[PDB]
Scaffold this motif. Structure first.
Motif, mmCIF file in Angstrom:
data_model
loop_
_atom_site.group_PDB
_atom_site.id
_atom_site.type_symbol
_atom_site.label_atom_id
_atom_site.label_comp_id
_atom_site.label_asym_id
_atom_site.label_seq_id
_atom_site.Cartn_x
_atom_site.Cartn_y
_atom_site.Cartn_z
ATOM 1 N N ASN A 93 0.840 -1.223 0.000
ATOM 2 C CA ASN A 93 0.000 0.000 0.000
ATOM 3 C C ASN A 93 0.867 1.263 0.000
ATOM 4 O OD1 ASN A 93 -2.521 -1.177 -0.133
ATOM 5 N ND2 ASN A 93 -2.695 -1.327 2.107
ATOM 6 N N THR A 125 -17.800 -2.910 -6.676
ATOM 7 C CA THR A 125 -16.506 -2.467 -6.081
ATOM 8 C C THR A 125 -16.138 -1.066 -6.592
ATOM 9 O OG1 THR A 125 -15.083 -3.516 -7.678
ATOM 10 C CG2 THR A 125 -15.743 -4.845 -5.744
ATOM 11 N N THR A 232 -6.891 -3.137 -8.080
ATOM 12 C CA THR A 232 -6.092 -3.236 -6.836
ATOM 13 C C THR A 232 -5.419 -1.888 -6.532
ATOM 14 O OG1 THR A 232 -5.840 -5.588 -7.200
ATOM 15 C CG2 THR A 232 -4.415 -4.593 -5.553
ATOM 16 N N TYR A 235 -7.851 0.454 -4.699
ATOM 17 C CA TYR A 235 -8.048 0.090 -3.278
ATOM 18 C C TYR A 235 -6.761 0.410 -2.514
ATOM 19 C CZ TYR A 235 -12.814 -1.164 -3.630
ATOM 20 O OH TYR A 235 -14.181 -1.109 -3.757
ATOM 21 N N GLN A 281 -12.245 3.841 5.158
ATOM 22 C CA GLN A 281 -11.640 2.637 5.794
ATOM 23 C C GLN A 281 -12.595 2.116 6.871
ATOM 24 O OE1 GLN A 281 -7.976 4.298 7.146
ATOM 25 N NE2 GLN A 281 -7.173 4.500 5.068
ATOM 26 N N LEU A 284 -15.596 0.390 5.278
ATOM 27 C CA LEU A 284 -15.286 -0.855 4.551
ATOM 28 C C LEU A 284 -14.897 -1.940 5.551
ATOM 29 C CD1 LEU A 284 -13.511 0.300 1.286
ATOM 30 C CD2 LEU A 284 -15.924 -0.136 1.776
ATOM 31 N N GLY A 314 -12.825 -4.228 3.169
ATOM 32 C CA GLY A 314 -13.012 -4.779 1.833
ATOM 33 C C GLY A 314 -14.340 -4.429 1.241
ATOM 34 N N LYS A 315 -14.515 -4.846 -0.001
ATOM 35 C CA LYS A 315 -15.753 -4.601 -0.776
ATOM 36 C C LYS A 315 -15.916 -5.724 -1.794
ATOM 37 C CE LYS A 315 -19.427 -2.173 -1.597
ATOM 38 N NZ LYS A 315 -19.985 -3.390 -2.225
ATOM 39 N N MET A 328 -12.189 -7.234 -2.987
ATOM 40 C CA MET A 328 -11.016 -6.372 -2.751
ATOM 41 C C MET A 328 -10.796 -6.312 -1.245
ATOM 42 S SD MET A 328 -10.692 -5.846 -5.945
ATOM 43 C CE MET A 328 -9.335 -4.676 -5.978
ATOM 44 N N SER A 330 -8.008 -5.151 2.064
ATOM 45 C CA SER A 330 -6.809 -4.398 2.511
ATOM 46 C C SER A 330 -6.603 -4.595 4.014
ATOM 47 C CB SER A 330 -6.887 -2.917 2.142
ATOM 48 O OG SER A 330 -7.153 -2.719 0.754
ATOM 49 N N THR A 335 -2.870 -4.533 -0.019
ATOM 50 C CA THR A 335 -4.172 -4.737 -0.694
ATOM 51 C C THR A 335 -4.081 -6.013 -1.531
ATOM 52 O OG1 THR A 335 -4.717 -2.439 -0.499
ATOM 53 C CG2 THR A 335 -5.824 -3.627 -2.271
ATOM 54 N N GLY A 337 -6.458 -7.780 -4.451
ATOM 55 C CA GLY A 337 -7.592 -7.822 -5.389
ATOM 56 C C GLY A 337 -7.863 -9.233 -5.861
#
Ligand SMILES: *C(=O)[C@@H](NC(=O)[C@@H](Cc1ccccc1)NC(=O)CCCCCN=[N+]=[N-])[C@@H](C)O
Ligand SMILES: [Cl-]
Ligand SMILES: [Cl-]
Ligand SMILES: [Cl-]
Ligand SMILES: [Cl-]
Ligand SMILES: [Cl-]
Ligand SMILES: [Cl-]
Ligand SMILES: [Cl-]
Ligand SMILES: [Cl-]
Ligand SMILES: [Cl-]
Ligand SMILES: [Cl-]
Ligand SMILES: [Cl-]
Ligand SMILES: [Cl-]
Ligand SMILES: [Cl-]
Ligand SMILES: [Cl-]
Ligand SMILES: [Cl-]
Ligand SMILES: [Cl-]
Ligand SMILES: [Cl-]
Ligand SMILES: [Cl-]
Ligand SMILES: [Cl-]
Ligand SMILES: [Cl-]
Ligand SMILES: [Cl-]
Ligand SMILES: [Cl-]
Ligand SMILES: [Cl-]
Ligand SMILES: [Cl-]
Ligand SMILES: [Cl-]
Ligand SMILES: [Cl-]
Ligand SMILES: [Cl-]
Length: 454
Positions: A93, A125, A232, A235, A281, A284, A314-315, A328, A330, A335, A337
């Motif tokens: 990240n 997403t 990715t 995110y 954040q 999610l 995530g999502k 996705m 993190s 992260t 994907g």
């Protein structure tokens, strides 16, 4: 395998640029098709013959663990619609460095690279990046803002659906995100269009290419098709407190004698405010904990309860005929994907994303941690100090005060909650149209409920 050819392809493009500049070839001469062919062939032969040293960002033990993970557990994706294909990108990240990826089930049976080559709609997403994130960044909503999920139609007359539901009523951003309701996302994007927000500016800073920003279904991945690697990178931006780093596998190419052909240059970009990113954040985090759209946290808690206590956000996304599933994920450090689908675009099973991909990605995350125990990190996501905390009504998502409902000046009180904003002033006072979206009929129904409760 997938790594050899991906690296070779990127190395060839960098060698092409280097050789063209070295031989003093004009931008104009470079437009000539015969000259491009010559320089592509010369780039290939230089790598093949040249003894260059290509330094990648690939963590060999992690990338090897991800290959063994898809070999051992890829079958968990097979849901009775034929062999399910898969792509995964694991990204640092703080740098955009790609540490490892899954190109597919088995290079030897199918060479198509589902991490870097295949483009599919990212479906729901898209919502955190293109709708909610930008709205929060623009000071048009906070964490406990209310959105309409009342029934509404697209401009072509079709009802906006969520599985077999035409919608419900008002709901918080948190409920909208946890369920991935579609109508609130539609109203959020419509609000951005109505306010002339430069959405394209945000998405192009993160390297997305979207041909038409007027598509009503854009926040549901209409008119968007992305690689797993690119998506990715989106995110990565949210997880890294709003700071984009361009994804890369190649860090450096050197001649045998140590001359630098190419070196990755970091160009960090604050795409979202720290306030916006750290608010998103938090939202999610609840998407995964709620387990509405993915079993991922249940799958991971069983495999590796210590790793499940890392700060996961995530999502999920599902294309409309279940052709594509996305998850996705993190932590503050990484992260990951994940896409699944079929090479010929035929439908997966209904639960392929909810259960199968969630279970597969729990195994993949466990395999990465087993190969590199500290890689996910024990750091928490946390609200930036620049976040504004507003005491707002649970009912309206806006500060208590007076509103005209059917002539009568009504004192709106009741249960309050802290709402997180990324502007200066935080949440406004309750207005009559307190929510994102909704018809005059919807608001009549909503206010009826709210007045009844006073
Ligand atoms: C999130 O994943 C939601 N579904 C989608 O975003 C789907 C279906 C959808 C579309 C518009 C409004 C509501 C629902 N998006 C989608 O299919 C867009 C991509 C289509 C591209 C065509 N090729 N294909 N596949 C869930 C939560 O309903
Ligand atoms: Cl590989
Ligand atoms: Cl490849
Ligand atoms: Cl030469
Ligand atoms: Cl390594
Ligand atoms: Cl890509
Ligand atoms: Cl698609
Ligand atoms: Cl309508
Ligand atoms: Cl909820
Ligand atoms: Cl735009
Ligand atoms: Cl793109
Ligand atoms: Cl436009
Ligand atoms: Cl449209
Ligand atoms: Cl690269
Ligand atoms: Cl790349
Ligand atoms: Cl040399
Ligand atoms: Cl900032
Ligand atoms: Cl949880
Ligand atoms: Cl579950
Ligand atoms: Cl979904
Ligand atoms: Cl297929
Ligand atoms: Cl911490
Ligand atoms: Cl916090
Ligand atoms: Cl504050
Ligand atoms: Cl306040
Ligand atoms: Cl403000
Ligand atoms: Cl609105
Ligand atoms: Cl109406």
């Amino acid at each position: 395998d997938y790594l050899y050819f991906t690296t070779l392809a990127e190395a060839q493009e960098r060698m092409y640029d280097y050789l063209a500049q070295r031989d003093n070839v004009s931008a104009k001469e470079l437009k000539n098709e015969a000259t491009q062919k010559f320089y592509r062939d010369l780039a290939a032969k230089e790598i093949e013959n040249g003894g260059y040293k290509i330094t990648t960002t690939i963590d060999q033990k992690i990338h090897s663990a991800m290959q063994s993970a898809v070999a051992d557990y890829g079958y968990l994706l097979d849901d009775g619609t034929g062999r399910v294909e898969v792509g995964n990108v694991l990204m640092d990240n703080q740098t955009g460095a790609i540490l490892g990826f899954v190109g597919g089930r088995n290079y030897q049976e199918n060479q198509n690279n589902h991490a870097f080559d295949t483009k599919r709609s990212p479906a729901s997403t898209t919502k955190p990046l293109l709708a909610y994130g930008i709205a929060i960044d623009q000071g048009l909503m906070g964490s406990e803002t209310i959105l309409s999920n009342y029934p509404t139609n697209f401009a072509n007359g079709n009802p906006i659906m969520y599985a077999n539901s035409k919608g419900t009523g008002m709901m918080t951003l948190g409920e909208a995100l946890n369920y991935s309701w579609n109508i609130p996302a539609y109203w959020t994007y419509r609000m951005l269009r109505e306010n002339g927000v430069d959405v394209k500016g945000y998405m192009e800073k993160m390297g997305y290419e979207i041909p038409e920003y007027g598509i009503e279904s854009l926040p549901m991945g209409g008119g968007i098709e992305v690689t797993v690697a690119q998506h990715t990178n989106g995110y990565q931006t949210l997880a890294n407190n709003g700071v984009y780093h361009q994804k890369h596998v190649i860090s450096k190419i050197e001649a045998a004698d140590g001359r630098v052909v190419y070196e990755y240059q970091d160009k960090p970009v604050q795409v979202y405010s720290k306030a916006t990113a750290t608010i998103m954040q938090g939202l999610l985090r609840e998407v995964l904990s709620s387990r509405v759209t993915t079993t991922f946290k249940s799958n991971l808690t069983s495999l590796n309860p210590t790793l499940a206590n890392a700060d996961w956000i995530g999502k999920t996304g599902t294309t409309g005929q279940d052709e594509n599933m996305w998850l996705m994920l993190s932590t503050p450090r990484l992260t990951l994907g994940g896409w699944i689908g079929h090479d010929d675009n035929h439908s997966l099973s209904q639960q392929a994303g909810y259960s199968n991909n969630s279970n597969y990605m729990a195994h993949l995350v466990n395999a990465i941690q087993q190969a590199s125990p500290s890689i996910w990190g024990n750091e928490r996501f946390a609200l930036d100090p620049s976040v504004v905390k507003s005491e707002v009504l649970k009912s309206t998502g806006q500060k208590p005060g007076k509103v005209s409902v059917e002539g009568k000046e009504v004192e709106v009180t009741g249960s309050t909650v802290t709402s997180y904003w990324a502007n200066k002033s935080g949440a406004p006072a309750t207005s009559y149209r307190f929510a994102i979206g909704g018809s005059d009929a919807d608001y009549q129904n909503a206010w009826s409920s709210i007045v009844g409760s006073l």
